[PDB]
Amino acid sequence: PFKHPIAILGAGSWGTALALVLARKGQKVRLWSYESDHVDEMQAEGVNNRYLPNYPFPETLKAYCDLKASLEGVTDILIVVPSFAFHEVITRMKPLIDAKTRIAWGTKGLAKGSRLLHEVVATELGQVPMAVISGPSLATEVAANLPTAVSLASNNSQFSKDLIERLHGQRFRVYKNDDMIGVELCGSVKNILAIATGISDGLKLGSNARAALITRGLTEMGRLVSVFGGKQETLTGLAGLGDLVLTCTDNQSRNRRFGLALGEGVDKKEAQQAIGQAIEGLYNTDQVHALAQKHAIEMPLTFQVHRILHEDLDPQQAVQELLER
Amino acid sequence: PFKHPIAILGAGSWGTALALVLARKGQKVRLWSYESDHVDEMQAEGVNNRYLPNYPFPETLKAYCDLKASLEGVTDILIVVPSFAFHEVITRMKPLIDAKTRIAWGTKGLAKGSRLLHEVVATELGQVPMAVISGPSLATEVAANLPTAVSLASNNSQFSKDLIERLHGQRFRVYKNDDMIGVELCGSVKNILAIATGISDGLKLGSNARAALITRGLTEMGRLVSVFGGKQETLTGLAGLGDLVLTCTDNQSRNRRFGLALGEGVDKKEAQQAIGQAIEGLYNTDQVHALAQKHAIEMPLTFQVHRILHEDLDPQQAVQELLERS
């Protein structure tokens, strides 16, 4: 058992940190990316210099260029591509996977048609074992072997046990959660809230203001969760509160960093280019905002961020309207 | 509605900041301190240099060193002393209470004997109208007039109305909350968690580990709240989550800096001497630990902090036992 290789699709910081966690335990890992130049860098250097420098790949970790090749002999797939590319990657996997394929993901966000990612998986690939991994997990700290805890929700007990067996260790811990819907929804909203708190911090509004915004953030996250059938227990757990407090308060949080630039008057284009990766917060804002309108759900922080990005709303004015009811 | 002066007992940073919020709106405020040389300093200088320097008093804010004098002609009182001094202050107020006295407090933590603050107030002074104000509110940021939001819970609708009317405003916002007990209990645990998360940071265990500990912290805070009849809505609100995130992540938190020192290897005695002014987290830990044990309440973080303080438990081992959970 646990001899079959595992494929991880997406070589951003988190996909790579997860590949490392597994590869270090001697498990064979195949790391694929649709960015060909990046794969060339990884194959040539044996490290992921553009997203996670200073952490060489162990021997059991190899970068792949060809999706088919990375999945040959693999039954368990862990997807960590950006939310905007999830549907496209699933579509590409459709004729490559087989009957016993099991699908997990660490991607956070919604897909076209305002759908939770598991629905995209189900529609395209049929009813298969599925799992979502999510919690407070800065990729650099995981890479550095600092203590970390995440939640894992699945529709299949054996798959959940198997994933936990692969990942769960002394310093990287994975706890079962039976609420996939709630884990997905909390994960799709937390980056949006971190942009908002980043904006507040950029405006130098203070620690008190940030704490208030975080509290209001969890309230709207909670509303979204309840409307779709998630559990309030998820809200106060690692996938909700945990990931939210980390992402809204840490200097290593890129979504917060982006918000902070906006708060300091940097335009969104220049702000993203300066950061250099994928600010999921931008994509998540649009995804969640559309879902909230489709279902007429009140989500004030999310709505203000969306106005800031698409209607030239002044950051100062935006935050002021939020704190002052 | 503000013909009469309001008295604020406790001239620490927070008490003084609250006094400024009110006095700046033109309300008459009397600020009392039990440190007598302290009132002389404030009367002479027109500022609280010991605890909130750089924020001069408006004309309507006056310091008093006599408790009786501060309460003469005043029926609304707002207590903001440390939890370890609450009992003493309530005791001294006994001969000064009148028929319409109303008592609010900004103090956080259990009083002597592991007593809830409203119980000390009700048992010792009678069942007077009571209220608690609690939320993420660094005193320095409030003095600077930066946006702040806090909860206010009361056992009397008229008192709630009157307090919110006095305090609520543009940058300092006060939201009605129906759960005094939940608000109190949340506030009595947050500094214990600040010490715990401070220790993890002192050990440089990282931001992921801190978030995991904050998450676990809220779980035991919820258990305590639940056992005394408080509400989950309070737990995820300003008095629970809000104040917890602020206190577990800020440089300004003295309880967190104390924890940082412990995590770095400093002994508790030297760590507190270096800080200088008394902190409440150790006292809070001891009172809550006693309460948890009296009622068989499981609170793992609080118990580990207690072990670190009183059983010589090594900090690294302590945090690794907390994180390496089943």
Residue linked to tokens 């970390």: A148
Q: By the CB < 8 Å criterion, does B281 face chain A?
A: no
Which residues in chain B touch residue A170, judged by CB atoms under 8 angstroms apart? 324
Residue type present at position A128: V
d(CA A229, CA A36): 40
d(CA A251, CA A4): 38
Q: Pick from B240, B224, B230: which is nearest to B181 by CA? A: B230
d(CA B318, CA B238): 29
The response to whether A30 counts as a known ligand-binding position is: no
Q: By the CB < 8 Å criterion, does B249 face chain A?
A: yes
d(CA A7, CA A18): 11
A149 and B252 within 8 Å at the Cβ level: the answer is no
Q: What fold is seen in the domain B188-326? A: N-(1-d-carboxylethyl)-l-norvaline Dehydrogenase; domain 2 (1.10.1040)
B245 and A211 within 8 Å at the Cβ level: the answer is yes
For A318-325, which contacts have Cβ atoms below 8 Å and span 24 or more sequence positions?
A318/A199, A319/A196, A319/A199, A319/A200, A319/A203, A319/A205, A319/A209, A319/A213, A319/A263, A322/A196, A322/A213, A322/A216, A323/A205, A323/A209, A323/A212, A323/A213, A323/B147, A323/B149, A323/B173, A324/B147, A324/B170, A324/B173, A325/B173
Which residues in chain A touch residue B206, judged by CB atoms under 8 angstroms apart? 138, 141, 144, 146-148
The response to whether B177 counts as a known ligand-binding position is: no
Q: By the CB < 8 Å criterion, does A142 face chain B?
A: yes
Note the resolution in Å, 1 decimal.
2.1
What are the DSSP E strand ranges found in chain B? 6-9, 29-32, 61-64, 76-79, 102-105, 130-134, 148-154, 172-177
Q: Are the C-beta atoms of A101 and A128 separated by less than 8 Å?
A: yes
DSSP lists the bridge partners of residue A149 as: A173
A105 sits in which H/E element? strand A102-105
3-state class (DSSP) for residue A121:
helix
Q: By the CB < 8 Å criterion, does B63 face chain A?
A: no
Backbone angles phi, psi at B207, to 5 degrees: -70, -35
Q: Are the C-beta atoms of A178 and A131 separated by less than 8 Å?
A: no
Q: Are the C-beta atoms of B177 and B232 separated by less than 8 Å?
A: no
3-state class (DSSP) for residue B131:
strand
d(CA A221, CA A228): 11
The response to whether B255 counts as a known ligand-binding position is: yes
Q: Are the C-beta atoms of A176 and A160 separated by less than 8 Å?
A: yes
Instruction: Tell which of A245, A247, A321, A325 to mutate to test the B interface (max B CBs under 10 Å).
Output: A245
Q: Which residues of A81-104 are buried (b: 16+ CB within 10 A; e: fewer)?
A: bbbbbbbebbeebeeebeeebbbb
Radius of gyration over alpha carbons of chain B, in Å?
19
d(CA B31, CA B38): 11
Backbone angles phi, psi at A140, to 5 degrees: -65, -40
Task: Pick B147's closest partner by Cβ from A136, A208, A235.
Answer: A208
DSSP lists the bridge partners of residue B105 as: B79, B132
* Residue B266 token pair: 């400093």
A138 and B214 within 8 Å at the Cβ level: the answer is no
Cα B23–Cα B25–Cα B31 angle in degrees, nearest 5: 10
List the CATH code of the domain at A188-325. 1.10.1040.10
CB atoms within 10 A of CB B241: 28
A77 sits in which H/E element? strand A76-79
Q: Are strands B172-177 and B61-64 parallel, antiparallel or unpaired?
A: unpaired
Helices A207-228 and A300-310: angle between axes, nearest 10 degrees: 110
The response to whether A254 counts as a known ligand-binding position is: yes
Query: What single DSSP character describes residue B178?
Result: S
Helices A315-323 and A207-228: angle between axes, nearest 10 degrees: 70
Q: By the CB < 8 Å criterion, does A214 face chain B?
A: yes
* Residue B126 token pair: 């009678």
| Sheet of strand B61-64, all strands in order from the earlier edge strand to the far edge | B61-64, B29-32, B6-9, B76-79, B102-105, B130-134, B148-154, B172-177
Helices and strands, counts by H and E, chain A: 16, 10
Q: Are the C-beta atoms of B128 and B210 separated by less than 8 Å?
A: no
d(CA A76, CA A92): 16
B138 sits in which H/E element? none
Q: Which residues of A18-47 are buried (b: 16+ CB within 10 A; e: fewer)?
A: bbbbbbbeebbbbbbbbeeebbebbeeeeb
DSSP codes joined into one string, A144-211: TT--EEEEEEES-HHHHHHHHHHH--SSEEEEE-S-HHHHHHHHHHHHHHHHHHHHHHHTT--HHHHH
Query: What single DSSP character describes residue B58?
Result: P
Q: Are strands A148-154 and A130-134 parallel, antiparallel or unpaired?
A: antiparallel
* Residue A74 token pair: 């693999």
Q: By the CB < 8 Å criterion, does A202 face chain B?
A: no
Q: Return all residues near B239 (Cβ < 8 A) that are at least 6 apart.
A: B134, B135, B150, B151, B153, B177, B182, B183, B186, B187
* Residue B288 token pair: 């809550």
3-state class (DSSP) for residue B6:
strand
A residues 99-138 lying closer than 8 A (beta carbon) to B: 135-138
* Residue A228 token pair: 């779709």
* Residue B36 token pair: 């007598």
Q: Looking at CA atoms only, how far is residue A206 from chain B in angstroms? A: 6
Distances (CA, A) of B29 to A12, A55, A80, B59, B102: 57, 60, 58, 10, 15
Q: Pick from A236, A219, A179, A228: which is nearest to A302 by CA? A: A219
CB atoms within 10 A of CB A146: 17
A148 and B209 within 8 Å at the Cβ level: the answer is yes
B147 and A206 within 8 Å at the Cβ level: the answer is yes
Q: By the CB < 8 Å criterion, does B223 face chain A?
A: no
Distances (CA, A) of B221 to A221, B214, B288, B300: 21, 10, 11, 10
Q: By the CB < 8 Å criterion, does B232 face chain A?
A: yes
3-state class (DSSP) for residue A96:
coil
Query: What single DSSP character describes residue A241?
Result: I
Tell me yes or no: is domain A1-187 CATH 3.30.450.150. Answer: no
Q: Are the C-beta atoms of B99 and B31 separated by less than 8 Å?
A: no
Alpha carbon A231 to chain centroid, angstroms: 19
d(CA B9, CA B15): 7
Backbone angles phi, psi at A112, to 5 degrees: -45, 140
Q: Which residues of A269-305 are buried (b: 16+ CB within 10 A; e: fewer)?
A: eebbeeeeebbbbbbbbbbbbebbeeeebebebbbbb
Q: Pick from B280, B262, B249, B268: which is nearest to B317 by CA? A: B262
Q: By the CB < 8 Å criterion, does B287 face chain A?
A: no
Which residues in chain A touch residue B138, judged by CB atoms under 8 angstroms apart? 206-208
Question: Which residue among B190, B231, B268, B269 is the active-site one?
Answer: B190
Q: Which residues of B35-50 are buried (b: 16+ CB within 10 A; e: fewer)?
A: eeebbebbeeeebbeb
DSSP codes joined into one string, A34-75: S-HHHHHHHHHHSSBTTTBTT----TTEEEES-HHHHHTT--
d(CA B9, CA B92): 11
Question: Which residue among A94, A100, A190, A269 is the active-site one?
Answer: A190
DSSP lists the bridge partners of residue A153 as: A132
Q: Pick from A191, A185, A186, A189: which is nearest to A257 by CA? A: A191
B147 and A323 within 8 Å at the Cβ level: the answer is yes
Q: Which residues of B258-276 are buried (b: 16+ CB within 10 A; e: fewer)?
A: bbbbbbeebeeeebbeeee
Domain ranges in chain A are 1-187, 188-325
Q: Which residues of B306-323 are buried (b: 16+ CB within 10 A; e: fewer)?
A: bbbbeeeeebeebbbebb
Task: Pick A147's closest partner by Cβ from B205, B214, B235.
Answer: B205
d(CA A299, CA A323): 14
Cα B144–Cα B149–Cα B150 angle in degrees, nearest 5: 115
Q: By the CB < 8 Å criterion, does B246 face chain A?
A: yes
Backbone angles phi, psi at A149, to 5 degrees: -135, 130
Q: Are the C-beta atoms of A221 and A235 separated by less than 8 Å?
A: yes
DSSP codes joined into one string, B218-229: HHHHHHHHHHTT
Instruction: Tell which of B18, B168, B205, B215 to mutate to test the A interface (max A CBs under 10 Å).
Output: B215
Which residues in chain A touch residue B136, judged by CB atoms under 8 angstroms apart? 207-208, 211-212, 215
Q: Return all residues near A175 (Cβ < 8 A) that are at least 6 apart.
A: A149, A150, A151, A152, A238
Helices A254-263 and A315-323: angle between axes, nearest 10 degrees: 110
Residue A190 annotated among the catalytic residues of the structure: yes
d(CA B155, CA B178): 8
CB atoms within 10 A of CB A264: 15
**Elucidation technique:** X-ray
Which residues in chain A touch residue B148, judged by CB atoms under 8 angstroms apart? 206, 208-209, 212
Query: What single DSSP character describes residue B48?
Result: B
DSSP codes joined into one string, B270-297: HHHHHH-S--SHHHHHHHHHHHHHHTT-
Residue linked to tokens 């004729």: A95
